[PDB]
Symmetry: C4
Subunit: 183 residues, 4 copies
């Protein structure tokens, strides 16, 4: 639905984030009854990408499939793919790491701690001695030790990988492997 629509919406997101299938299905049911399918779909895509994210990238991607199914079907049948994804999202590994990393990056810009794009990263089609831009694909492991962060932000670390699921365990390993390579 006595409750406001935004309180049901809030409890829906918090239930899925909180791994409670039954509560999330209860709040989905209330939303289905109220009938704003477009809002359910929007909120479901936010949840999968905010709270599940790198915990299960395939499942987060599958919410978009389910939403496209929902738009094509409409209620009552739309409720079926949404139920499927809600259960999947509730029980998958949770990660907000990428969401928080970008928000840390946005914080530095709004506070004016941003620098300029380093000259070797600028578009050469529009346009200092040295190697210029190094294309990683030419190198072993398709990686080159190169500065990409602006001079003012060379020490910035936004992304702290999590190990709640096997996908981000491996991404995190790669992240620290690169940090070892750079030293």
């Amino acid at each position: 639905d006595g409750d406001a629509h935004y309180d049901v919406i809030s409890a829906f997101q918090k239930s899925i984030r909180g791994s409670d299938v039954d509560a999330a299905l209860h709040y989905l049911a209330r939303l289905v009854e109220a009938g704003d399918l477009a809002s359910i779909c929007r909120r479901l895509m936010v949840i999968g990408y905010e709270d599940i994210g790198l915990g299960n990238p395939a499942a987060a991607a599958r919410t978009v499939n389910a939403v496209l199914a929902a738009e094509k079907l409409g209620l009552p049948e739309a409720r079926i793919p949404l139920a499927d994804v809600v259960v999947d999202l509730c029980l998958s590994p949770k990660s907000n790491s990428a969401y928080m990393a970008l928000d840390a990056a946005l914080a530095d810009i709004r506070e004016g701690k941003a620098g300029d794009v380093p000259d070797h990263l600028r578009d050469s089609h529009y346009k200092n001695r040295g190697v210029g831009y190094q294309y990683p694909h030419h190198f072993d492991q398709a990686w080159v030790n190169q500065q990409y962060l602006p001079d003012k932000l060379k020490n910035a670390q936004y992304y702290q990988p999590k190990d709640t699921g096997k996908y981000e365990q491996a991404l995190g390993q790669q992240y620290y492997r690169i940090k070892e390579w750079k030293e």
Copy 2:
């Protein structure tokens, strides 16, 4: 035969894991020529009967429907056939479908309550005491989410017909053991 009987038989054959029967009914539906109707039914079947048995296969139905729409008949029949076989021989699960309809039954029968205060939107004792699971170990906190009236409600009973829901089910029960 009425269109709705062929439709019914199509869904029942896929749910029943009969490739040859499902393809016979698909063929009947293809020959009748209403592609959007076929596509709607397939997405429903994929999500209703396959669901958590093979989430990737259910999602792939949407990909095939999009291909079908862009191609049109006769070529549209090809992604649809591919999908029918996949769904027929994939593990079957109706658990999530049944769980939501049990939740809906509780709401229609007035048995549901109000949003617990800590779950309410704080931007509008609203939200007071809410614990954000991402700060915790395993990204999970013991916290009430169901309304007080439905605190003993149990809608979802995990199936184990496929390895994906096997793993989701283990997590479901793991959480139940954590809460004791």
Copy 3:
């Protein structure tokens, strides 16, 4: 050189697992600028020739086509190249495609019968009536789904060129063993 010949050659090269030839014809098509015909044919190839050989790759062709459409040429060529290589080097199956065409043939030749009464839509003979597979073990029930006239029909002959259809095929024959 004619457009349909290049289109024909494109499909045959991918089906034939020749990356270098498929990319040559893709390039001929890219240079002719008909992005929509590349997209249509690539979705046909993915589902017709790769199909159950790699269902994720056939579905990924739709993602690429959506990217191609959103980007336009020249940038559209990149998602297309990616999936052309993927489709060329993926396991090939035409089994689903051939199975549906076998089912269509039986209908067009008047060998089909009517929907069995237990599969008809109830919302519009003594015995069990329709049995619902989700109630059963392995979510499967022995129940006829083919019409009486087509009760001995086999349309789907599973292939084993990739691990996915191998497992689908194993399930298909298991059901056949269960039914005896």
Copy 4:
């Protein structure tokens, strides 16, 4: 600082596996509020630089872009952040992209020939004619698909930075061993 430079630095950082730098330029673009440019560039990066390194990650970019379009800013920044970190830490391959551009080069330099007779469309010399790969073992046939003028051409050179293309690459050389 110009829009084109931030767009450039964004791609270069992701290609360069720098999560923190990619998110910084992502953030700049989000603050500028051109959602469409982020979406366009991300689809190009996914397919250009990741490509066969992680085909499912490249495809997921399209899912994230569709989510982003339906959500709009500020909420659209969330799916986009997710795919950014994924792409940064995914295996990199530009092999398919470089292969098609090599194929395009031969066409523009007039080194291309005509479609071989057996590959031409049959709906509009002695010997076996067109052989259909699906009739054969491993669904492959030793057959010419490249035009006579380009019979020795090699565009695709498989990389092994990811497990997916490791396998595709092995299949590429297995076909080469079969042809000798």
